[PDB]
RNA sequence: CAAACGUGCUACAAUGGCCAAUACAAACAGUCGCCAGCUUGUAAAAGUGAGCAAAUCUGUAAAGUUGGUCUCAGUUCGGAUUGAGGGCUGCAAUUCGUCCUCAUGAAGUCGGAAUCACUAGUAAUCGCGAAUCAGCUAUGUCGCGGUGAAUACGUUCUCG
C-alpha cells in the first residue's frame, strides 16, 4: 500500500476500498460476501462547502430577541 | 530570600515562589548553580545554597525591585505625563479599550442605573 | 519550673566564625542561612 | 558569654572614649523587657498558648501575661482577661538574647535595611521592633491568629542618648 | 536610541533650541509638536503645545529627557461623573 | 467613561501543561513578495545570499504518536491590568501598532431565572490559506483540509 495526502483514517478508508478492489478483481465470487456483509465502497462521506456568513457548516453565529 | 521553601517538589519549582523570579530565570538560575535537579529533591546540603544566595545578589532581589518600581512609579507620577495623571485616577496606562471593559482596577463590580424611557 | 536551654554549637555556617550561643538542647548543630559577620548589610 | 568580653575590653575603651576616668560610670546592662501586646484574643483563638511556648522556649523562665489597665470600650475588655506576656531578663541571659537576636534574628529576617533615627525615650533606651514570627532559630510551627511581632527594648543606666548609642555601636548594632 | 529611526525626532523645532541656547536662555518661545522627542538641551523653557483648543504654556521639569514631548501635553478633560 | 446589553476568543486543567523526538492535508498567494540555506542574534529579528514571472521554488502543518513530567492546591491550569530593556514597520509609535525577554501570576471550580446551532465528517472541533496594508491584540471576515461523534418515539402541549 502507497497513499499520497489525507489523513490516517481517510488514508485507511483509501487502502480499504483498493484492497476490496483489489480482492474483487482477484476473484469474482468475492463480490458475494461484499454483498453479504454490505461494507462497499465510499458512502461519498467528504467535507461539505462551507456558506458565507456561517462560522461552521451547519452553525449560525445565534438568534438574539 | 533564605525562607523555607514548600517541600515534595522539584528544584525548578522550587525557585519559583520566591518573588521576581519566574520561570525560564529560575531555569537559569538553577543551572548556574549546577545542583543537577532530580525528582521532588528540596535539601542536599548547604553548599548548594551560598552559591544560590551569591548568584541571586548578582541579580536583584524582591525587596529591591520594589522599591525601585515604587521610585519609578512615582517619578513617573510627580512629573508632567499623562501617564502619571492616568496612574493616579486608577486606570489602565498602555491603552486598552476604555469603554466598558477594564474592571481589574475600576472596582471588583458596581453599577449605576442609566437614564429610564417610556 | 524553669526549662533547662544550654548552648548549642554555632561556628561554620557561611562564614568561619561564630560565638557559642545557648538555645534549645533538644538538638545541637543546627545550620542558618546567614550569620551577622558575613552579612553584606552589616559591612559594606 | 559576652560579659567576659564585655569587662575583657569594651570596658576599658568605654572609660577612654568620654573623659571621666571611673569604671563603673559608663554606660551598662540592666534588663530586657519582652512584650506580646496581644490584641486578637478577644475570641476563641490560640489564646497565646503558640506564643507562650515559644517565648519559654526562646527564654526557659515562665513568661507571665498582663490584664487590661483600664475598660475599652470597643471590645469587651473591661480589667481583666489577661493579654500579652512579660518577661524581665537579667544575668546570663542578657548576652543569650543579644547574641541571637543580633547574629541569628536580623540576617534571618525576609529584608533587612536597618532603622536608627530615634527610638529612645530622650534618656537613652532603644526599642526594637520584631516584624515576623520566624526570627528565631527555634519556633513551635503552629500558626498564632495573626501573624505578628515582638516588643523588645533595651535599658541604659545614662539618661544620655549619646553615650548609650556609643555602647550599642560599640556592641555592633546595625544602624 | 536603535540608530534605525526607532527614536526618532523631526529635528526642526531643534533649530530653534540652538538658536535659544545661546541667547542667555531667555524664557518666551513658541514651540508645539507632538511629534518631538525631548533631549536635555531642551529643559529651561517653556512650550505652546497645541491640545486642541489654545496653545497651553507647559514647562517640562529636569529630571528626564527619555518620553516625547506629545505625551506631556493633557488634551482629554476629566470625567466629572454625571449619574442620571 | 460611573455603567448594561450584546456578538466572540481565551480560562476554570490531569479527556492537560512542560520537556524532547516524531508523522499525516488541501486549497490559495508570491518579484523591491514568498524568502531557501547560512553568520548569527536567549529569541524577537537583523544580516548574507540561492531559487521562484512560478504543478520545478517558497509558504516549515496542528491536533496525533514514544518516553518522562507534574498527583487534586484557587496550584505548575489560567493569564490582564502593571515596570524595565530591546525589535520591525512606516518621515511618525503618548493618545493610537504589534513582537520578544525578564518579571505580574490576581480574579476565576463549571456560571441564576432564560436562551441559541445543528440529522454525519454535522455539531464538537485542530492547525493553516487568503481580500487588508509598510505595519496593525481583527481573539475578525471568505475558505482549506486533519480526528471525530450522540440522537431522532410522536406531533397533546410550545413557537413560527
Same mark, same amino acid.
Given at each position: 500500500v +502507497? +497513499?499520497?495526502?489525507?489523513?490516517?483514517?481517510?488514508?485507511?478508508?483509501?487502502?480499504?476500498?483498493?484492497? +476490496?478492489?483489489?480482492?474483487?478483481?482477484?476473484?469474482?465470487?468475492?463480490?458475494?460476501?461484499?454483498?453479504?456483509?454490505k461494507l462497499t465502497t465510499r458512502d461519498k462521506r467528504v467535507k461539505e462547502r462551507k456558506k458565507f456568513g456561517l462560522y461552521g457548516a451547519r452553525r449560525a453565529p445565534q438568534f438574539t430577541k | 530570600l533564605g525562607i523555607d521553601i514548600p517541600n515534595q517538589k522539584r528544584i525548578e519549582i522550587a525557585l519559583t515562589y520566591?518573588? !521576581?523570579?519566574?520561570?525560564?530565570?529560575?531555569?537559569?538560575?538553577?543551572?548556574?548553580?549546577?545542583?543537577?535537579?532530580?525528582?521532588?529533591?528540596?535539601?542536599?546540603?548547604?553548599?548548594?545554597?551560598?552559591?544560590? &544566595?551569591?548568584?541571586?545578589?548578582?541579580?536583584?532581589?524582591?525587596?529591591?525591585?520594589?522599591?525601585?518600581?515604587?521610585?519609578?512609579?512615582?517619578?513617573?507620577?510627580?512629573? !508632567?505625563?499623562? &501617564?502619571?495623571?492616568?496612574?493616579?485616577?486608577?486606570?489602565?496606562?498602555? !491603552?486598552? &479599550?476604555?469603554?466598558?471593559?477594564? &474592571?481589574?482596577?475600576? !472596582?471588583?463590580?458596581?453599577?449605576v442605573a442609566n437614564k429610564k424611557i417610556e | 519550673f524553669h526549662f533547662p536551654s544550654q548552648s548549642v554549637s554555632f561556628k561554620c555556617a557561611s562564614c568561619s566564625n561564630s560565638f557559642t550561643i545557648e538555645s534549645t538542647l533538644k538538638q545541637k548543630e543546627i545550620t542558618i542561612?546567614?550569620?551577622?559577620?558575613?552579612?553584606?548589610?552589616?559591612?559594606? | 558569654n559576652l560579659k567576659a568580653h564585655y569587662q575583657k575590653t569594651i570596658a576599658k575603651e568605654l572609660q577612654k572614649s568620654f573623659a571621666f576616668s571611673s569604671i563603673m560610670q559608663v554606660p551598662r546592662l540592666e534588663k530586657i523587657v519582652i512584650?506580646?501586646?496581644?490584641?486578637?484574643?478577644?475570641?476563641?483563638?490560640?489564646? *497565646?498558648?503558640?506564643? *507562650?511556648?515559644?517565648?519559654?522556649?526562646?527564654?526557659?523562665?515562665?513568661?507571665?501575661?498582663?490584664?487590661?489597665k483600664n475598660a475599652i470600650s470597643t471590645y469587651k475588655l473591661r480589667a481583666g482577661q489577661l493579654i500579652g506576656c512579660k518577661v524581665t531578663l537579667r544575668g546570663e541571659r542578657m548576652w543569650a538574647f543579644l547574641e541571637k537576636l543580633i547574629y541569628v534574628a536580623l540576617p534571618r529576617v525576609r529584608d533587612?535595611?536597618? *532603622?536608627?533615627?530615634?527610638?529612645?525615650?530622650?534618656?537613652?533606651?532603644?526599642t526594637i521592633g520584631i516584624k515576623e514570627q520566624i526570627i528565631?532559630?527555634?519556633?513551635?510551627?503552629?500558626?498564632?491568629?495573626?501573624?505578628?511581632?515582638?516588643?523588645?527594648? *533595651?535599658?541604659t543606666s545614662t539618661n544620655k542618648d549619646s553615650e548609650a548609642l556609643a555602647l550599642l555601636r560599640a556592641l555592633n548594632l546595625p544602624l | 536610541r536603535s540608530?534605525?529611526?526607532?527614536?526618532?525626532?523631526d529635528a526642526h523645532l531643534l533649530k530653534k533650541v540652538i538658536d535659544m541656547n545661546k541667547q542667555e536662555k531667555k524664557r518666551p518661545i513658541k514651540t508645539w509638536?507632538?511629534?518631538?522627542?525631548?533631549?536635555?538641551?531642551?529643559?529651561?523653557?517653556?512650550?505652546?503645545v497645541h491640545n486642541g483648543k489654545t496653545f497651553i504654556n507647559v514647562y517640562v521639569t529636569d529630571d528626564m529627557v527619555g518620553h516625547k514631548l506629545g505625551e506631556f501635553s493633557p488634551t482629554r478633560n476629566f470625567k466629572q461623573h454625571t449619574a442620571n
Open positions: +502507497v +497513499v499520497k495526502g489525507g489523513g490516517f483514517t481517510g488514508q485507511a478508508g483509501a487502502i480499504r476500498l483498493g484492497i +476490496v478492489r483489489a480482492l474483487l478483481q482477484f476473484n469474482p465470487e468475492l463480490k458475494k460476501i461484499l454483498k453479504s456483509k | 520566591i518573588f !521576581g523570579i519566574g520561570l525560564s530565570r529560575s531555569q537559569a538560575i538553577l543551572k548556574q548553580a549546577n545542583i543537577n535537579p532530580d525528582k521532588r529533591v528540596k535539601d542536599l546540603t548547604e553548599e548548594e545554597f551560598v552559591a544560590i &544566595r551569591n548568584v541571586a545578589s548578582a541579580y536583584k532581589i524582591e525587596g529591591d525591585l520594589r522599591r525601585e518600581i515604587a521610585l519609578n512609579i512615582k517619578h513617573l507620577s510627580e512629573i !508632567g505625563a499623562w &501617564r502619571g495623571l492616568r496612574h493616579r485616577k486608577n486606570l489602565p496606562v498602555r !491603552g486598552q &479599550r476604555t469603554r466598558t471593559n477594564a &474592571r481589574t482596577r475600576k !472596582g471588583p463590580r458596581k453599577t | 542561612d546567614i550569620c551577622g559577620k558575613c552579612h553584606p548589610f552589616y559591612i559594606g | 512584650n506580646m501586646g496581644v490584641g486578637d484574643a478577644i475570641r476563641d483563638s490560640k489564646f *497565646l498558648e503558640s506564643a *507562650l511556648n515559644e517565648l519559654h522556649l526562646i527564654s526557659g523562665q515562665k513568661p507571665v501575661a498582663t490584664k487590661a533587612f535595611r536597618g *532603622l536608627s533615627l530615634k527610638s529612645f525615650d530622650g534618656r537613652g533606651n532603644y528565631f532559630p527555634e519556633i513551635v510551627y503552629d500558626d498564632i491568629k495573626r501573624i505578628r511581632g515582638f516588643d523588645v527594648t *533595651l535599658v | 540608530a534605525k529611526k526607532g527614536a526618532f525626532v509638536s507632538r511629534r518631538s522627542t525631548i533631549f536635555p538641551e531642551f529643559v529651561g523653557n517653556t512650550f505652546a
